Amino acid sequence: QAIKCVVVGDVAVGKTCLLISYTTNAFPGEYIPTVFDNYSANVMVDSKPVNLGLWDTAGQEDYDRLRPLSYPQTDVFLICFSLVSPASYENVRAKWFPEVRHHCPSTPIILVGTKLDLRDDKDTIEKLKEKKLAPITYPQGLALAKEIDSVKYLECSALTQRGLKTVFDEAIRAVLCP
Ligand SMILES: Nc1nc2c(ncn2[C@@H]2O[C@H](COP(=O)(O)OP(=O)(O)O)[C@@H](O)[C@H]2O)c(=O)[nH]1
Ligand SMILES: [Mg+2]
C-alpha cells in the first residue's frame, strides 16, 4: 500500500527533524539539511505492508503560493505545532487548517504536537514565562484537535522518539480508515 502523507506547520516546529528522526531513527538537531525533501519508509501496521511517502514543506510565508503544489493526491496530512510555541498552535487555526481544507476538503488530518521533550525543560518554561506564555498542555492540544476535527491528536519528540512511531501508525490507520 502506497500512502502519501504531507507535513505542514510553522517554520521551526520540527517538521524536518520529525521526518528524519522517524525514517532513520536518528535526530539531526546538530546537522539539519536545508533542501526541502521527501522521504520514505516501509512500515507494518495491523498486519498490512505499507510504503509511506513523507513529504516535507516550506512553511515560510514566502512559499504560500508554491507550497500547495505538493498537495494533490495526498492521503493524510500532519498539521504540526510546537508544544513550546503558542504562536505555532495559534497558526493551526489561523493558517494551516484553513489552507489544508481549502485545497483538500476531505483528506484526513492528524494534529501533532512536537518537541514534547522541551515541555518540562526549565530554561524553556522560564523563557516562555518572560513572554507571559507557557507550554501547550495535553488538554489544550486535544481541544484544538476537537476544534479542527482532526482524526487524532498525538504528541511526540524527534529528539527522544517518544510517541514518534504512533504518529505515523495513526497517520496510516486514518487512511483505510475510521
Ligand atoms: N528539543 C527538541 N528540539 C527539536 C525537536 N524537533 C526539532 N527540534 C529543533 O527545532 C529546530 C527546528 O527543527 P526543524 O525540523 O528544522 O523545524 P522545521 O522548520 O519545521 O522543519 C531545530 O533547531 C531542531 O534541532 C524535538 O523533538 N525536540
Ligand atoms: Mg524543515
Curated annotation (Swiss-Prot):
Keywords of this entry: Acetylation, ADP-ribosylation, Cytoplasm, Disease variant, Glycoprotein, GTP-binding, Hydrolase, Lipoprotein, Methylation, Nucleotide-binding, Prenylation
Entry EC number(s): 3.6.5.2
Modified residues (N6-acetyllysine): K146
Pfam families: Ras (PF00071)
Location in the cell: Cytoplasm
Binding site for GTP: 9-16, 56-60, 114-117
GO molecular function, one term: protein kinase binding
InterPro entries: P-loop_NTPase, Small_GTP-bd, Small_GTPase, Small_GTPase_Rho
Glycosylation sites: Y31
Tissue specificity statement from the Swiss-Prot or TrEMBL entry: Hematopoietic specific.
Inhibition and activation profile: Regulated by guanine nucleotide exchange factors (GEFs) which promote the exchange of bound GDP for free GTP, GTPase activating proteins (GAPs) which increase the GTP hydrolysis activity, and GDP dissociation inhibitors which inhibit the dissociation of the nucleotide from the GTPase.
Residue interval(s) of motif Effector region: 31-39
Catalytic activity: GTP + H2O = GDP + phosphate + H(+)
Spans through the membrane: none
ADP-ribosylasparagine: residues carrying this PTM: N38
Effect of D56N: In IMD73A; dominant-negative mutant; binds GDP, but not GTP; inhibits oxidase activation and superoxide anion production in vitro
Function text: Plasma membrane-associated small GTPase which cycles between an active GTP-bound and inactive GDP-bound state. In its active state, binds to a variety of effector proteins to regulate cellular responses, such as secretory processes, phagocytose of apoptotic cells and epithelial cell polarization. Regulatory subunit of the phagocyte NADPH oxidase complex that mediates the transfer of electrons from cytosolic NADPH to O2 to produce the superoxide anion (O2(-)).
PANTHER family noted in UniProt: RHO FAMILY GTPASE
Disease cited in the entry: Immunodeficiency 73A with defective neutrophil chemotaxis and leukocytosis: An autosomal dominant immunologic disorder characterized by onset of recurrent infections in early infancy, leukocytosis, neutrophilia, invasive infections, and poor wound healing. Immunodeficiency 73B with defective neutrophil chemotaxis and lymphopenia: An autosomal dominant immunologic disorder characterized by respiratory infections, cellulitis, severe invasive infections, B- and T-cell lymphopenia, and impaired neutrophil chemotaxis. Disease onset is in infancy or early childhood.
Name the record gives this protein: Ras-related C3 botulinum toxin substrate 2
